[PDB]
């Protein structure tokens, strides 16, 4: 058979949750096998910054950036499933990589 891997990248948590749900509902409406929303480790890119302009260096303030990931895999990609997956609309906060 053919294996189609769907990767979901998101900055917010509930966005990736909703996208995973919608993907699953859409594909299983067409009768295809899903492994499910397999989670992946979340990147954290940290940035430390001095709060004030002009010196006062010991006073800093830390930022972070979280990238949550879920893995969606469909088995036996029926052409109808593929056609639906191209037509699926999802929120901007989510990134869908289809391959």
């Amino acid at each position: 058979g053919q294996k189609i891997r769907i990767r979901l990248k998101a900055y917010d948590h509930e966005a990736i949750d909703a996208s995973a749900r919608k993907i699953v509902e859409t594909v299983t409406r067409t009768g295809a096998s899903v492994v499910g929303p397999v989670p992946l480790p979340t990147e954290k890119n940290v940035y430390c910054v001095i709060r004030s302009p002009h010196k006062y260096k010991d006073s800093r303030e830390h930022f972070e950036m979280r990238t949550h990931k879920r893995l969606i895999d469909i088995l036996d990609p029926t052409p109808k499933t593929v056609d639906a997956l191209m037509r699926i609309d999802l929120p901007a906060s989510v990134d869908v990589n289809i391959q």
Binding site: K9, A10, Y11, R51, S52, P91, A92, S93, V94, D95
Partner: protein, 208 residues
């Protein structure tokens, strides 16, 4: 420097981001486009209160949501002002710009607009005490507002000194995370310099 920006204090819990899009390789271009957009919309129209500007980007198409006190001034009935602003947003080459102008329901419950109105008054000639009192009464009239604090600092009345005055009413729990605090800040242009007005409006709690 004492108190942090409440919106940034509550970003992950109570409040939400003013711009939603994801791009890794394009993050730089996206952010510089956003800065250009917000500078354009700030410098353009002061007449109608610009409460908030939200930007969404998906591939080539770009969506800009703006919340306004009075949309009648924002877009001409023939579409003149909308034409100007869309022409500028095409100058900023966001490719497709689907632009929506929205009206903020309660005007005096929005701290940004309250600060903007007090700045307008204090810039024309109005006494700062009168401005703060009018703002406080107007905000406290509406139901959802629980408490409000209004602060303005600078040269007040043309005095050659720096005075800071804050007026409070109700509850303003700054250190409470679940407290729904909406913050606003404007810098009033006067003849004696620029003076700032900060407003906190506390409207209940958010329980998730």
């Amino acid at each position: 420097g004492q108190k942090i920006n409440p919106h940034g204090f509550r970003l992950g819990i109570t409040t939400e981001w003013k711009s939603r899009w994801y791009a890794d390789k394009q993050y730089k271009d996206y952010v510089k486009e956003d800065v250009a957009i917000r500078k354009l919309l700030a410098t353009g129209l002061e007449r109608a209160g610009i409460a908030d500007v939200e930007i969404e980007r998906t591939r080539d198409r770009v969506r800009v949501d703006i919340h306004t006190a009075r949309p009648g001034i924002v877009i001409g009935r023939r579409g003149t002002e909308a034409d100007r602003i869309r022409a500028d947003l095409e100058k900023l080459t966001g490719k497709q710009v689907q632009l929506n102008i929205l009206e903020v329901k309660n005007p005096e419950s929005q701290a940004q607009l309250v600060a903007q109105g007090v700045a307008e008054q204090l810039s024309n000639r109005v006494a700062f005490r009168r401005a703060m009192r009018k703002a406080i009464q107007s905000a406290m009239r509406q139901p959802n507002v629980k408490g409000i604090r209004v602060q303005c600092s600078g040269r007040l009345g043309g005095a050659e000194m720096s005075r800071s005055e804050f007026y409070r009413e109700g509850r303003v729990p700054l250190h409470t995370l679940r407290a729904d605090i909406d913050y606003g800040l404007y810098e009033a242009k006067t003849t004696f310099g620029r003076i700032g007005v900060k407003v906190w409006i506390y409207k209940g709690d958010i329980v998730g």
